[PDB]
Design a protein around this ligand. Structure first.
Ligand SMILES: Nc1nc2c(ncn2[C@@H]2O[C@H](COP(=O)(O)OP(=O)(O)OP(=O)(O)O)[C@@H](O)[C@H]2O)c(=O)[nH]1
Ligand SMILES: Nc1nc2c(ncn2[C@@H]2O[C@H](COP(=O)(O)OP(=O)(O)OP(=O)(O)O)[C@@H](O)[C@H]2O)c(=O)[nH]1
Ligand SMILES: [Mg+2]
Ligand SMILES: [Mg+2]
Lengths: 224, 224
């Protein structure tokens, strides 16, 4: 086959997509699985003045494999507004709706040259990209596997399970992984006991990202 | 018929269930719709030392209609742990799993004496009560209408739509209302434009709670 593709979404903005994506791509590359990081859509940016957007961080990592990469090779629709992409596009670029067919082509072209293509979304599964499509729809069009990153705070149970319900209702392979931050041991006392129970009762368990680099590389690469 | 019943859930703990419930019951009572507030399950409490839990606030309001009410008349399963109810119950009261058949009886008994029975949940729709049931399951067993309160911050779009997807997938009447706090005008610039779009495209619109006291009383009381 050509390279595999893994979409990274989240329970909430700031849950840890970018941190986790970069740690997973680093692990994969260290294991000889040639992996690129892409941020096709990004809001809240001003590239004239700031070089630490998600796409810039991914570009830094990516140039360790290809010096010739530039920002426009890995991020395609970029907006100043800190909002859903649909809204940002309508306000800043009214004559250029986001074209997910184009994005699908561009992202799949990287499966020629990489073993794994990691695609970070924006905003969450239900966040609108176009009038007709949300991030999940985009992931479905890509035929990617899905890694949903959860925050590690009170509330994670509800948030994970809301996403579980949406994902299990669609035809894609997915995992949910909690981004368990340093210095949080309330998690183990408050939320973990339910995660444990859920995992005995579910055929698709919720994992802890930090425990799961090998498992998640296996997931991303398995099969066709 | 006997009195109507409205369940109040939320996108997230602290979104504003209790504030909104109390404002809606106050409005209803001022309109001559005799309304009680119930908090059947509550975690994170210590009644020996603190009298400002949700049940205590509801009791304050409720005693304006019935001096004889006490806390145990309106809240039935109460735990110290700040966690999902299932976990709190398993740790603090291992021999008494929450009995939603009992709760259904107790809550319906209030439809004899009230025009509207408002029931606040805990935690969120997917938060576990028993091994088999979450808050949504409880609401379904009650045959209540559902009011889902959303926070007003960036992220509300995703959160509302995740809940929308779950609710529309089940057989109940529901509304989603944003608790738009004082001093937030970012909402109108960032999130409202999408809410507006969504509402033109949906047969069940997302409303703003503060604009909607009349509409929400109408919703709660309509029909059987
Ligand atoms: N961990 C920290 O938590 C913050 C958010 O982490 P990110 O990995 O950037 O989260 P994210 O989910 O990619 O955030 P967005 O792409 O902005 O939604 C960062 O400042 C990290 O350093
Ligand atoms: N608004 C404030 O926001 C905080 C949370 O509001 P509540 O109405 O208590 O929210 P809630 O959703 O009922 O919170 P929980 O029942 O604790 O989940 C309170 O301190 C309010 O005064
Ligand atoms: Mg990011
Ligand atoms: Mg409350």
């Amino acid at each position: 086959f050509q390279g595999h593709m893994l979409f990274i979404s989240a329970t909430n903005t700031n849950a840890g997509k970018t941190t986790c994506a970069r740690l997973l791509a680093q692990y994969c590359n260290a294991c000889g699985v040639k992996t690129i990081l892409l941020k096709p859509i990004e809001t809240g940016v001003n590239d004239a003045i700031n070089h630490s957007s998600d796409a810039h961080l991914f570009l830094q990592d990516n140039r360790l494999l290809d010096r010739s990469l530039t920002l426009k090779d890995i991020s395609f629709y970029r907006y100043h507004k800190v909002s859903a992409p649909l809204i940002a596009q309508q306000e800043e670029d009214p004559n250029a709706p986001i074209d997910t067919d184009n994005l699908t082509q561009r992202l799949h072209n990287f499966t020629k040259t990489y073993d794994l293509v990691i695609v970070e979304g924006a905003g969450g599964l239900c966040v609108p990209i176009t009038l007709e499509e949300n991030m999940l729809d985009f992931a479905l069009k890509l035929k990617a596997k899905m890694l949903l990153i959860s925050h590690d705070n009170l509330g994670l149970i509800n948030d994970c399970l809301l996403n579980d319900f949406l994902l299990k209702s669609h035809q894609l392979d997915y995992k949910i992984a909690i981004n368990l931050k340093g210095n949080n041991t309330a998690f183990h006392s408050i939320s973990l006991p339910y995660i444990e129970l859920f995992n005995t009762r579910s055929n698709n368990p919720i994992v802890i990202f930090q425990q799961s680099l090998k498992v998640l590389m296996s997931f991303a690469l398995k099969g066709s």
